[PDB]
Amino acid sequence: EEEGSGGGQ
C-alpha cells in the first residue's frame, strides 16, 4: 500500500 508510480531510471 505504498504510493508513487515512479520506479527509478
Next chain:
Amino acid sequence: DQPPKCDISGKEAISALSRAKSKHCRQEIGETYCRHKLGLLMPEKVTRFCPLEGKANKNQWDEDSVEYMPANPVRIAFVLVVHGRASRQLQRMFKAIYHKDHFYYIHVDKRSNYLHRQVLQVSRQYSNVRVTPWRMATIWGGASLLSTYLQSMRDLLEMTDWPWDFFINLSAADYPIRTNDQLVAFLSRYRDMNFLKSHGRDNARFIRKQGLDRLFLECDAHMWRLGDRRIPEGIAVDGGSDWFLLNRRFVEYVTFSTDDLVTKMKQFYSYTLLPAESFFHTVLENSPHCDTMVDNNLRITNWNRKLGCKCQYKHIVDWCGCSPNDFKPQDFHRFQQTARPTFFARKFEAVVNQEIIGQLDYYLYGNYPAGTPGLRSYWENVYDEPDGIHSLSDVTLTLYHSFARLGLRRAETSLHTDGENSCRYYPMGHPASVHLYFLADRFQGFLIKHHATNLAVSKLETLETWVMPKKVFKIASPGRLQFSEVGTDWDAKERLFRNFGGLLGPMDEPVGMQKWGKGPNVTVTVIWVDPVNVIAATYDILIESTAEFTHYKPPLNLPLRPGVWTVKILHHWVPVAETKFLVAPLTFSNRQPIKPEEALKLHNGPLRNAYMEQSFQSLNPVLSLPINPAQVEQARRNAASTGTALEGWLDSLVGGMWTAMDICATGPTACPVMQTCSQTAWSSFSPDPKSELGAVKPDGRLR
C-alpha cells in the same frame, strides 16, 4: 536545420536529440536545455507560507458516522479523464456515481476519438454533464496531465451556474465502493479539508525514484529526460498518489494566486515526470491552507509491484514506471475494511475480469430484476467506421474482411431449399464496426458489422457476424502444464495477450506463453514448426517450483511463411502438449489490394531461407515431421497468387481456425432464417441495460 544557441554536451540531451524525430521537437529540446544551462529555467529558492513546523495530519473513524442526513449537502464536481475503448464500462460507472445535484466534466484523450463520440451522447442527454472542448494527448507520466487538471479547474471555477464544493478526479478504471449518500454525508461533515495521500516511506528515496531531481520535457507524445536539476531550497517537497479530493477554496488558491509559491511551482512542474503525483502535495503543505490536509485520499489502490513494476512504459518516457493491478473476485473482502474511510477503488477492467465489478455494483445498489439480459456479457468496440481503414493495419483489415465472408457463407449454407437461395450475399465495401465479445469472463470472439447485397432480391442489407476461434490446445498422456498459447503484446502485469484474437501477419514476431501449476522444478523442450514442417527453433526452459507463467519471443527471420504453425512441448522427448496459431497472408498493402510483386515478396518465407542461424533438420525424422516436396512447391505457388486465388487461400486457412457461430440482420432482410440482431443474445445490438442510460428517477439517480 539550425544549430543550437548553446553548446550541448549533456549525455541525456544528446541522446534525446538523436532519438527525436521532428524538427520542432529537436528545437524545443535544445531551447529547454540552453535555458537550464544558463540557470534561467528552474527556480532555486521558494517562499514557504505555512506557519506549521511540519505536516498537519488530521482525523478517528466510525462506520456509523456516515449514516446521518446533512442539512446542507455538498455538491461535487467530478472530473473524468478517460481514454481507450471501454465505453460501456465507463457508462456503467457513470451510472453508479450519477446524481442530479452533482456535476460531471469529461476530458477524453485526443487519441481516443471513438470514446469521445460515445461520451458526447452522454453530455447531450444531461444538463449537468459537459465535455472539455480542448483535448490533450495525456501519455502516461506526461507533464500534460497536470496542465489538464489545472485547465479544468479554471474552466470549472468560471462556470457560475455550477456551485460545486469538492473536486474529484476519476478514470475509466475507477469504481465506487460506497453509495453516493454516504460519500455526501462524509464530505458534508469535512467540507474544509483536503484529501491527499503521501508515499508512506522515506522522502529522499521518493524523490530519487520519482525522478524529481531530473529535468523532463514532453514533446511528440514522449517524455525526454534532459539532465539533472536541484530541488529548490526553503520548501518541503512531498508526493504520493495523484488521485485526490480537493475543496473549492484550495482549487481557487491554486488557480488564481500569484504568490511566490504557486508561481514557481507551476514553472517547476511544467518539466516534471508524474507531476500530479507531487505538485498538489507540495503546494498544499507549504501554503496557507497547510492545516487542512488529511493524509488519506479515500481510495483503495491495488498495488502489487511484484507484478506491476516491469518498466513497461520505457517506449513512452525515459524512466521506469509502475501501475496498479486489476481487481479479481477474490479481492471483494478488501472493499469491506473499516480501518480508514474509503469511497473509491482502482483499477477495474471488464476485458480482464467483469465478475468483481458485478459483485460490487449489486452489493451497493441491489440486484437487477429477474430476467434482465446481458448481465454476464461484455461488448467492446475495437474498430468504428468514422475512424477510417487507415486507422486499422493491413493484418486486421485483411482478417476482418475474411470473418465477414465466413459469415456470408454461413448464411447461404444454413438455408435448405431446392429453389432460389434467398440467403446468398455479395460483400460490399469495408467493415462498419468490430466488437470484442465476452461471456462470463470468457473470450467469445469478434462481432463484425458489414454490408452485403442479397442476390435474390438484389438489395443491400446490413448484417452482424459472430466468429469464434477453434480450440487448438491439446494435452497428451504423460504433469504441471496447464495451458499454452501464442500471441503478441503480452501484458506482464495482467498475464495475458492484449491481441485478444491472436491475429498475426507474416511480419509479426510471435510470442510463446506457458501456464503452470504448482509442483517441483522441471525442464521442458519447446519446438516451433512452420506450415511445411520446417523446424524454426528449439530451446529448453527451466520451470522453477514457484513459476506460474513463462514466455519467450524466439528470434525468427522475417517474413514468416503463411499458414498454420505448430508449437510443441516435450519432456525428455516424451510429448506433453501442443498448440497451433495462424500466420495469415495479406490481401491488402497500404490498405490497397496487394500486387503480385509485393505478394511474392511477402508470402514466400524468410529471406535467408532459414529462421535462425543454427539448423534443426536433424530433428524432422526424430519427431516424425517429414517435409513433403509437393507441399513445399504448392506453398511456392500459393506465394505468387493474388485476387481471387489469394482470397481463396486465405479463406480456407481462416475457415480452418475460426467458426462462424451465427449471423443476424440489423434491419429488414429477405433471408428467411436470419433473426433480427436486437432479438439475439449475442449481438452488440441486443439489450444491455446495465450500461444503458435513461431518464433521471425521482430520487435523482440513474441506477
